[PDB]
Enzyme design. Structure first.
Site, PDB file in Angstrom:
ATOM      1  N   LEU A  12       0.823  -1.201   0.000  1.00 18.08           N
ATOM      2  CA  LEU A  12       0.000   0.000   0.000  1.00 18.08           C
ATOM      3  C   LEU A  12       0.868   1.268   0.000  1.00 18.08           C
ATOM      4  O   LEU A  12       0.341   2.382   0.034  1.00 18.08           O
ATOM      5  CB  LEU A  12      -0.989  -0.023   1.186  1.00 18.08           C
ATOM      6  CG  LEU A  12      -1.974  -1.193   1.238  1.00 18.08           C
ATOM      7  CD1 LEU A  12      -2.669  -1.234   2.571  1.00 18.08           C
ATOM      8  CD2 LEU A  12      -2.997  -1.122   0.114  1.00 18.08           C
ATOM      9  N   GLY A  13       2.184   1.078  -0.082  1.00 21.94           N
ATOM     10  CA  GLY A  13       3.160   2.155  -0.133  1.00 21.94           C
ATOM     11  C   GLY A  13       4.340   1.918   0.774  1.00 21.94           C
ATOM     12  O   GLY A  13       4.327   0.980   1.577  1.00 21.94           O
ATOM     13  N   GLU A  14       5.371   2.769   0.649  1.00 22.42           N
ATOM     14  CA  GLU A  14       6.579   2.677   1.464  1.00 22.42           C
ATOM     15  C   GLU A  14       7.140   4.064   1.758  1.00 22.42           C
ATOM     16  O   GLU A  14       7.225   4.899   0.855  1.00 22.42           O
ATOM     17  CB  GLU A  14       7.637   1.776   0.795  1.00 22.42           C
ATOM     18  N   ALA A  16      10.140   6.436   4.438  1.00 20.35           N
ATOM     19  CA  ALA A  16      11.553   6.471   4.839  1.00 20.35           C
ATOM     20  C   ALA A  16      11.866   5.282   5.743  1.00 20.35           C
ATOM     21  O   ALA A  16      12.985   4.762   5.702  1.00 20.35           O
ATOM     22  CB  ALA A  16      11.861   7.772   5.569  1.00 20.35           C
ATOM     23  N   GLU A  19       7.497  -0.512   4.991  1.00 19.68           N
ATOM     24  CA  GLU A  19       6.479  -0.738   3.966  1.00 19.68           C
ATOM     25  C   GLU A  19       5.122  -1.004   4.640  1.00 19.68           C
ATOM     26  O   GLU A  19       5.070  -1.673   5.670  1.00 19.68           O
ATOM     27  CB  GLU A  19       6.878  -1.960   3.108  1.00 19.68           C
ATOM     28  CG  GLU A  19       6.026  -2.194   1.868  1.00 19.68           C
ATOM     29  CD  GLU A  19       6.143  -3.585   1.275  1.00 19.68           C
ATOM     30  OE1 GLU A  19       5.851  -4.566   1.994  1.00 19.68           O
ATOM     31  OE2 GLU A  19       6.518  -3.694   0.084  1.00 19.68           O
ATOM     32  N   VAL A  20       4.035  -0.492   4.046  1.00 22.99           N
ATOM     33  CA  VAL A  20       2.668  -0.712   4.534  1.00 22.99           C
ATOM     34  C   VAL A  20       2.037  -1.767   3.634  1.00 22.99           C
ATOM     35  O   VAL A  20       2.145  -1.665   2.414  1.00 22.99           O
ATOM     36  CB  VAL A  20       1.827   0.594   4.665  1.00 22.99           C
ATOM     37  CG1 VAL A  20       0.366   0.297   5.015  1.00 22.99           C
ATOM     38  CG2 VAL A  20       2.438   1.526   5.709  1.00 22.99           C
ATOM     39  N   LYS A  35       2.108  -1.604   8.961  1.00 23.20           N
ATOM     40  CA  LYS A  35       3.387  -0.968   8.697  1.00 23.20           C
ATOM     41  C   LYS A  35       4.436  -1.950   9.231  1.00 23.20           C
ATOM     42  O   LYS A  35       4.421  -2.293  10.414  1.00 23.20           O
ATOM     43  CB  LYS A  35       3.502   0.396   9.407  1.00 23.20           C
ATOM     44  CG  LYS A  35       4.630   1.265   8.861  1.00 23.20           C
ATOM     45  CD  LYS A  35       4.867   2.509   9.701  1.00 23.20           C
ATOM     46  CE  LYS A  35       5.737   3.503   8.964  1.00 23.20           C
ATOM     47  NZ  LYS A  35       6.253   4.574   9.857  1.00 23.20           N
ATOM     48  N   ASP A 121       4.164  16.242   8.015  1.00 24.49           N
ATOM     49  CA  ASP A 121       4.229  15.765   6.633  1.00 24.49           C
ATOM     50  C   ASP A 121       2.848  15.743   5.990  1.00 24.49           C
ATOM     51  O   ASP A 121       2.440  14.739   5.394  1.00 24.49           O
ATOM     52  CB  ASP A 121       4.918  14.384   6.549  1.00 24.49           C
ATOM     53  CG  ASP A 121       5.743  14.162   5.269  1.00 24.49           C
ATOM     54  OD1 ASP A 121       6.084  15.181   4.580  1.00 24.49           O
ATOM     55  OD2 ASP A 121       6.072  12.975   4.968  1.00 24.49           O
TER      56      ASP A 121
HETATM   57  C1  LIG Z   1      -4.148   1.111  -4.651  1.00 23.90           C
HETATM   58  C2  LIG Z   1      -5.527   1.546  -4.172  1.00 23.90           C
HETATM   59  C3  LIG Z   1      -6.592   1.168  -5.192  1.00 23.90           C
HETATM   60  O1  LIG Z   1      -5.546   2.980  -4.045  1.00 23.90           O
HETATM   61  C4  LIG Z   1      -5.844   0.899  -2.806  1.00 23.90           C
HETATM   62  N1  LIG Z   1      -5.284   1.474  -1.592  1.00 23.90           N
HETATM   63  N2  LIG Z   1      -4.164   2.261  -1.545  1.00 23.90           N
HETATM   64  C5  LIG Z   1      -3.955   2.491  -0.256  1.00 23.90           C
HETATM   65  C6  LIG Z   1      -4.917   1.875   0.556  1.00 23.90           C
HETATM   66  N3  LIG Z   1      -5.163   1.852   1.906  1.00 23.90           N
HETATM   67  C7  LIG Z   1      -4.391   2.291   2.970  1.00 23.90           C
HETATM   68  N4  LIG Z   1      -4.961   2.167   4.181  1.00 23.90           N
HETATM   69  C8  LIG Z   1      -4.200   2.459   5.211  1.00 23.90           C
HETATM   70  C9  LIG Z   1      -2.851   2.892   5.124  1.00 23.90           C
HETATM   71  C10 LIG Z   1      -2.033   3.376   6.163  1.00 23.90           C
HETATM   72  C11 LIG Z   1      -0.824   3.947   5.884  1.00 23.90           C
HETATM   73 CL1  LIG Z   1       0.118   4.575   7.208  1.00 23.90          CL
HETATM   74  C12 LIG Z   1      -0.327   4.033   4.579  1.00 23.90           C
HETATM   75  C13 LIG Z   1       0.979   4.743   4.261  1.00 23.90           C
HETATM   76  C14 LIG Z   1       1.702   4.205   3.015  1.00 23.90           C
HETATM   77  C15 LIG Z   1       3.025   4.944   2.787  1.00 23.90           C
HETATM   78  N5  LIG Z   1       2.757   6.421   2.649  1.00 23.90           N
HETATM   79  C16 LIG Z   1       4.037   7.188   2.343  1.00 23.90           C
HETATM   80  C17 LIG Z   1       4.655   7.013   0.924  1.00 23.90           C
HETATM   81  O2  LIG Z   1       4.512   8.417   0.593  1.00 23.90           O
HETATM   82  C18 LIG Z   1       3.861   8.672   1.863  1.00 23.90           C
HETATM   83  C19 LIG Z   1       2.134   6.944   3.915  1.00 23.90           C
HETATM   84  C20 LIG Z   1       0.794   6.258   4.130  1.00 23.90           C
HETATM   85  C21 LIG Z   1      -1.044   3.452   3.555  1.00 23.90           C
HETATM   86  C22 LIG Z   1      -2.349   2.959   3.797  1.00 23.90           C
HETATM   87  N6  LIG Z   1      -3.126   2.659   2.713  1.00 23.90           N
HETATM   88  C23 LIG Z   1      -5.749   1.249  -0.343  1.00 23.90           C
HETATM   89 CL2  LIG Z   1      -7.101   0.261  -0.022  1.00 23.90          CL
END
Ligand SMILES: CC(C)(O)Cn1ncc(Nc2ncc3cc(Cl)c(C4CCN(C5COC5)CC4)cc3n2)c1Cl
Length: 261
Positions: A12-14, A16, A19-20, A35, A121
């Protein structure tokens, strides 16, 4: 991969740090976000911050699990992805959608500031959406305590993302945490309305920033923004953090209160 009863199905992203991943509980079918962090002092701080978080526009912390040198941070899953993905390059999004997310961003920032927490941020990638498109402020690895025992602490460390940072953060040894967050909220607002960032950093060297201070609103991204949200940005994107608008007076702004389609 997997942790306990949870399967790590999709990235779901990464950031510094780590990875989430999307964690699907094999038994309950509950979907959360995890995370995954490798190796100590900042993670103990982050968990402490996360545990306090209890608001509808803030990502809910569920608990943590340590598996030797690996930490798993269980958080609320925002199925709607990020705000970044809702912004159309060079277009932005419709004004009523931008106003709604800005309201929910203010609610979350007001909350965090209320409990003496600064995010540091605020940018579209850290602003997540639930199934009902409710905005959530996520990622607390750069978050810090600016107020403890009703005593305010000035920040000195330079943290954040350059196109979102307030200019005092680049020019000062110490600065107040809250106007820094307000400023990035203003860049988020600009991105939502123009699908473009105003500059690469708020420093006199960058021509785009100097153009803003000169009031050159006939230039991008400003010419794409309506006069009412532009009036708000004029008050948020102010160089001096003392002259800069605060959330109580943002809540009084005409565009902020404008009923939109
Ligand atoms: C691909 C899609 C269709 O959009 C599906 N999709 N994307 C994300 C999620 N859900 C979700 N939920 C909770 C999360 C909690 C966290 Cl803490 C994060 C972090 C990931 C890394 N970033 C850093 C990189 O530049 C900033 C900061 C946030 C992601 C989450 N993503 C869904 Cl479902």
């Amino acid at each position: 991969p997997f942790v306990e009863d949870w399967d790590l199905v999709q990235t779901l992203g990464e950031g510094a740090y780590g990875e989430v991943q999307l964690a699907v509980n094999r038994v309950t079918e509950e979907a959360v976000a995890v995370k995954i962090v490798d190796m100590p002092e900042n993670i103990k701080k982050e968990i402490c911050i996360l545990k306090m978080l209890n608001h509808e526009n803030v990502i809910k912390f569920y608990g943590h699990r340590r598996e030797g040198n690996i930490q798993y941070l269980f958080m609320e899953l925002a199925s709607g992805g990020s705000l970044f993905d809702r912004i159309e390059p060079d277009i932005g999004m419709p004004e009523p959608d931008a106003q709604r997310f800005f309201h929910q961003l203010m609610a979350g920032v007001v909350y965090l500031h209320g409990i003496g927490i600064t995010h540091r941020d605020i940018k579209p990638h850290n602003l997540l959406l639930d199934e009902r498109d409710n905005l959530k402020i996520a990622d607390y690895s750069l978050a810090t305590v600016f107020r403890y025992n009703n005593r305010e602490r000035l920040l000195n460390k330079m943290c954040g993302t350059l196109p979102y940072v307030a200019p005092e953060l680049l020019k000062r040894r110490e600065f107040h945490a809250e106007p820094v967050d307000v400023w990035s909220c203003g860049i988020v607002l600009t991105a939502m309305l123009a699908g473009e960032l105003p500059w690469d950093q708020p420093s006199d060297s960058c021509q785009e920033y100097s153009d803003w201070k000169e009031k050159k609103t006939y230039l991008n991204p400003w010419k794409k923004i309506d006069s009412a949200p532009l009036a708000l940005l004029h008050k948020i994107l102010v160089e001096n953090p003392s002259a800069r608008i605060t959330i109580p007076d943002i809540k009084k702004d005409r565009w902020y209160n404008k009923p939109l389609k």
